[PDB]
């Protein structure tokens, strides 16, 4: 169940002189990468990055590649224009990033479409939520915005983001249903680490879970301790699942009073754990 997403993350980086720009596109369905294209392959092509994508035949891969190659060209041109907008010399490397895709509800209604850009690590221009106005981030992007308004391009994007994006997302979820339509609950436990003669650290672990969204919180009898925790960012295990931990320093003698609570799509009921070996 639940919402899903199809997203591409696209990066072009110039290389001063007579390398053409590196162009890289990666696709994800929810938290699972499924394709890539890299210009630095010696024969570059859209390629599957998940086994279930091998179900697509030669025409899919060819059509995807032609599209990537066309967009590669787009960035070669747009990198040159930006450099002129910002009066940058040819000595320097610069970076365009683009993301686009669709979020859909459980019912398959589009929830949100995206099409946006960053230049040299900051927002450049973004298609708004309405899928027809643009937010520009600086005076250079304003020039782009007026051009894309005159041209009516938002109509084209809107058409893709409604319709096509969603249709292809539905198809991927079907082709990949054994891995994409599956939830893996966190395997959770608490570890005990001596700190001082008065204190110890309790670390609550959440391991092997999918999808990546998760809440880990420590309490003391329904008193939230979230702002007293040490946390790490959710991290990939490398096998398609994720990891997280949250830790608290507690007095010797009182460890059992503290509870770690785990919320996750895979849990109908949140988990409550303690240091109780």
């Amino acid at each position: 169940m639940g919402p899903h997403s199809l997203r591409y993350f696209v990066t072009a980086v110039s290389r001063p002189g007579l390398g053409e720009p590196r162009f890289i596109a990666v696709g994800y369905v929810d938290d699972t990468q499924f394709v890539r294209f890299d210009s630095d392959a010696d024969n570059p092509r859209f390629e599957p990055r998940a086994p279930w994508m091998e179900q697509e035949g030669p025409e899919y891969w060819e059509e995807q590649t032609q599209r990537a190659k066309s967009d590669e060209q787009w960035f070669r041109v747009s990198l040159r224009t930006a450099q002129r907008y910002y009066n940058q010399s040819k000595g320097g490397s610069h970076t365009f990033q683009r993301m686009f895709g669709c979020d859909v509800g459980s019912d398959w209604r589009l929830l949100r479409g995206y099409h946006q850009f960053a230049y040299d690590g900051r927002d450049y221009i973004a298609l708004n939520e309405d899928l027809k106005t643009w937010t520009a981030a600086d005076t250079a992007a304003l020039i782009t915005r007026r051009k894309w308004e005159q041209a009516g391009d938002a109509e084209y994007y809107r058409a893709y983001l409604e319709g096509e994006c969603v249709e292809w997302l539905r198809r991927y979820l079907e082709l990949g249903n054994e891995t994409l339509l599956r939830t893996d609950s966190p395997k959770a436990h608490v570890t005990y680490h001596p700190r001082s003669q008065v204190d110890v650290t309790l670390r609550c672990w959440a391991l092997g879970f999918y999808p990546a969204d998760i809440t880990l919180t420590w309490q003391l009898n329904g008193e939230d301790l979230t702002q007293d925790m040490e946390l790490v960012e959710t991290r990939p295990a490398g096998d398609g699942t994720f990891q997280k931990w949250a830790a608290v320093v507690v007095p010797l003698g009182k460890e059992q009073n503290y509870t770690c609570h785990v919320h996750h799509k895979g849990l109908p009921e949140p988990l409550t754990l303690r240091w109780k070996p």
Binding site: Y8, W74, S78, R98, F117
Partner: peptide
């Protein structure tokens, strides 16, 4: 399929 951009920047 992959969306090809329209007008350039």
């Amino acid at each position: 399929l992959y969306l090809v951009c329209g007008e350039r920047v």
